[PDB]
C-alpha cells in the first residue's frame, strides 16, 4: 500500500500522512469495478504461485522489461493482491454475474424474469432503477471524497496558520455546497425553500471567502473542482463494460449449448473459456490501472500534496 | 411512438463521440511532450501526470448532460 | 405529438459537442507548449495554469446555450 | 407539425458550436506563441495577454446571433 | 406554420460559423508570426496589430449576410 | 411561399461560408510570410499588403452570386 | 408502425462508439509515437510508457455506456 | 410542384464554394514561397505574380457553369 | 420491419468505419516509428509488436458492437 | 421534377471536389516550383508544363457536368 | 420495399470504403518507414513486409461483416 | 415518374470527385519529389514523368464506373 | 419503386470514391519515399516499385464489390 504512495514526492514535515486511505478505499474501488468471482479465484491462483515464488526466495526477473525484484516487495505484493480478491468476491456476491451469467442455470437465482429461491440484489437488464441507484452512489462517494479532501486541507491551513489557505478552502466547499444545492434543486422536486436558502448561503461564503483571498484566481478553478468531483462516474463504465462483454460471451457459450449441445457445446466452451481469460487479461490491466490513477489525482490535488 | 426517441439518441451520441473526440486530440499533444520530459526527467512524474489528466471535465460534462436528456425521455 | 424536442435536442448536443472540439484543439498546443516550459522553469507553474485554465471559457458558452435551449424544452 | 423551432435550435447550436471551433484553432497557436514569449521574456505579458484575449468576438457574435433568433423565436 | 424560416436560420448560422472558421484559421498563424515579431523587437507593433486585425471583413460580411437574411424573413 | 425559399437561404449561405473558408486559409500563410518578409525588411511593404489583398476575389465573388440568387427571388 | 426509432437510436449509438474509437486512436498514436523511442533507446522506462498507453482507453471504454444503455432502452 | 429551384441554388453555391476553398489553398501555399522569393529578389515579381495568378481558373469554371444553369433557372 | 434491420445495418457500418479509421492512425504513426526502432536496434522486436498490437481492441469493440446489434436483428 | 435539381447538385459537387483535387495538387506542385524557380530560371518552361498536369481532373468534371445537363 | 435493401448496400459502402480510407491512412507512413529502412539495409525486406501487411486485418473484417448483411439482404 | 436518377447522379458524381480528390492529394506529394529531383538533375526526367503519370488509373476506374452508371438509366 | 436501385448507386459509388481517397493518400507518401529513393540511388526501382503496387488492392476490392451487388441488382 505505501509503495504507491512512497513512488511520488515526499510530504513536507508537520504535514498530514495520507497512506491510509488508500488501504482503504483501493480495493473497494477494484471490487466495485471487476466482481468476478471466478477471475478472482484465477487472480487467487496467481497470488499462490507468488507465495511459491517467495518460499522459495529467489528472487524475479524477466529479460523482456529488465525487471529486477525482491521478495519483500513481492510479500507486499501477495498481501495486496490478498485484498484485492477479498473484495472483489465480497462485492461479486452482490454483483453475482460472474463469467457472464449463470441465471439460466441456476434456477436457485432468484430474478423477476427467471424465479428462484435465492434473490440476486442486482440485475443487469434492468438498467431503469439499477443505473439510477449505483449512479447516485456514485456520485456521493465522490462529493463525501472530496469533502474530506477539501476538510483536511482546511484542518491544514487552521493548524500551520496558513489561514489563507483555509479562507481558500471554505471557499471552495461553499462553491461546493452551493453549485450541488442548485443542481439538485434543479434536477429534483419543488418547494425548495430550504434549498435555495443553502444555495444562498454557500453563494455568499463563496463571495466573503473570495474578498478573503482578494487576489482574484480560484473563480474559474471552481468548475475545474466541480469537474473532479463528477470525474467519480467512470467506475460504474469501466464495471458495466466488464460485466457486459462477460454478459455476450455467456450468450455466445448460450447459443452454442442451446443449437448443439450434444456435441457443440465442448467447442463452444473452451472458445468462450480462452477468449474469457485473454479479453480479461487485456481489459483488466486497465482497469486495475484506473482506480489507482483517480485516487492519485483526485485526492492529492486537492489537499495540497504537490509542495514538497 | 414518437421519433424524436431517435432524434435524442442521435443527439447524445454525436455530443458525447465528439467530445471524446476532442479529448483526445487534446491528450495526445499532452502526452507527447509528457513522456519525453518524465523519461530523461523522472522528477517531475506528478506534475506530468497532474498536466495529462486534467482535460477529462468536457467528456464527464458531456456524459452527464446527455444522461439528463435520457432521463428527461 | 410534436417531434421538435428531438431536433432541438440534436442542435444542443452538435453546440455542446463542437465546442469539445474547439477547446480540446486549443489545450493540446497550449498544454504542449506550458509543459515544455516547466519540464525547466517550475517557477512560471502558475502562468501554465492560467494560461491552459482560460480557453475553458467556450464549454462554458456551450453549456450555457445548451442549458437555454433545455429550458425552451 | 411544429418543426420549425428544432431547425432554428439546430442552427443556433451549430453556429455557436463552429465559431467555438474557429476561436479555438485560433487560440492554440497564439497560446502557444504567447507562452513561449512569456517563458523567455517576463516582461511581454501584456501584449502576449491581450492578443490571446483578442479573437473572442467570433464566438462574441455566435451568441449574438443567436440571442437575436431566439428573440425572433 | 413554414419550414422555410428555420431553413433561413441554418442558412444564416452555417455562413458565419464558417466564416468564423476563416477567420480564426487567418489568424492561427497571423497571431504566432506578429507575437514572434514583437518578441523580436517591438517596433513593428502597429504593423503586426493591422496585419491580424484586418481579416475582420470576413465576419463582416457574416454579419451582413444574416442581417439581410434577418431582414428577408 | 414555399420551402425552396429557405432551400435558397441555405444555399448562398453554404456559398458565402465556403468562400470565407477559402480566403481565410489563403491569408494565414500569405499574412504570415507578409509580417515576417516585413519585419525583416519594412520596406516590402506594398507587394505584402497586395499579396494579402488578393485573396479578397473570393469573397466578393461569393456575395456577387449571393446577391444575384437572392435577387433572383 | 414507427418502428424506424430502432434504427435510428442504432445508428445514433454507432457515431458514438465511432467517434470515441477515433478519438482515443489518435490519443493512442501520439503517445505511442512518442514513448517508442524512449522506451528503445533506454529499456528501462517501460512502465511509465505502457501506463500512458493505457491512459487513453477509458475514453472509449465510458464511450460503449452510452451505446449498451441504450440497447438496453430497445 | 417546384421545390427544385432550392434544390439548384444549393448545388450552385456548394460548387462555387469548393471552387474558391480549392484555389484558397492554392493560393495559400503558393504565397509563402513567392513572398520569399520576392523578398530576396525585390525584381523578379512578376513571374510570381503570373504563377501564382494562374490558379483563378477554378473558380472562372465554377461561375460559368453556376451562370449557364441559374440562367436555365 | 426490413427498413429497421437496413437502418441498424447502416448503424453498425459506420461504427466500425470509424472505428478501423481510428485504429488506422494509431497504427501508421506506431509502427512507422517502431520500424525506426527495429532498425536501429534489432532486439526490441517484441516491444513494437505488442505497441503496434494493442490498438486493435477498438476494432475488436466495433465489431462485437456490430454484431450485438446483428443479434438484436 | 426534383431529379432535376437532384443532378444538378450532383454535378456541383463532384466539379467542387474535383476543383478540391486540383487546388491541393497545384499548391503543393507550384510551392516547389516557385521555390524551385529561383535557379530554374532556365528550366522555367519544363517546370510549367510540370505544373499543368492536373487541370484534366477539372476537365473531365466538366465533360461529366456538361453531359448531365444535356440530359436534361 | 426495396429501401431495406437500398440502405443495407449503403451500409455495406460506409463500412469497406471508411476501412479502407483507414488502411490507406496506416499504409502511408508504413510505408514510407519501410522504404527508408531499406534504402540502406535490403536486409530488413521480411520485417518491413509484415510490417505493412499487419495492418490489413480491418479491410478484411469490414468485407466479412458487409458479406454477412449482404447475404442477410 | 422518375425518382431514381437523381440520386444515382449524385452518387457517380460524388464517386468521380473523390476519385480527383484522391489522385490530387496523391499528385501533390509525387510531383513535389519530382521536381525536387528535377531542380538538380534533368536525367530523372522518364522517371518523374511514369511516377506522375501512374496513379490515374483511380479516376479511370471512377469514369468507368460512371459510364456504366449512365449507361444504367 | 426505382429508388431501391438509386440508393445502391450512390451507395456504390460512395464506396468506390473513398477506396480511391484511401488509396490517393497512400499513395503520395509512399511514392514519395519511393521517388526520393531512385533518385538520389538510382538502383532501388523494383523495390520502389513494388512496394507502391502493394496498396492497390483496396481499389480492386471497391470495384468487386460494386460489379457484385450491381449483379444482385
Redesign the interface.
Known sequence: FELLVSF??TPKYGTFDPTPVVPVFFPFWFGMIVGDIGYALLFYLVGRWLSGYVKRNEPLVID???LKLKPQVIGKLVHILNWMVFWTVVWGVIYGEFFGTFLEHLGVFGTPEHPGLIPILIHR?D?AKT??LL?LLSVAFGVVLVFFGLALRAYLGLKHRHMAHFWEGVGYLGGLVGVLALAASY?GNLQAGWLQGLMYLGFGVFLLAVLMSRIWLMI??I??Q???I??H??I???G??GG??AG?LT?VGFALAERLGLLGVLLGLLVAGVLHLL?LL??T??HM??PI?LL??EF??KFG??EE | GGLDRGLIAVGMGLAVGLAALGTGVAQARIGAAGVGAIAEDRSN???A??FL??P???V??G??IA??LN?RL
Open positions: 511520488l514526492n523482456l522489461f529488465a437488464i438498467t443505473a439510477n449512479i434536477l474559474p478553478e468548475f475545474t466541480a469537474g473532479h463528477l470525474s462516474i467512470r460504474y463504465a469501466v458495466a463494460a457486459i462483454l455476450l450468450d479479453i487485456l481489459t490491466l486497465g490501472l484506473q490513477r492519485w489525482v492529492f490535488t500534496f504537490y | 512524474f506528478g506534475t501526470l497532474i489528466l486534467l477529462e471535465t468536457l464527464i460534462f456524459l452527464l444522461f439528463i432521463g
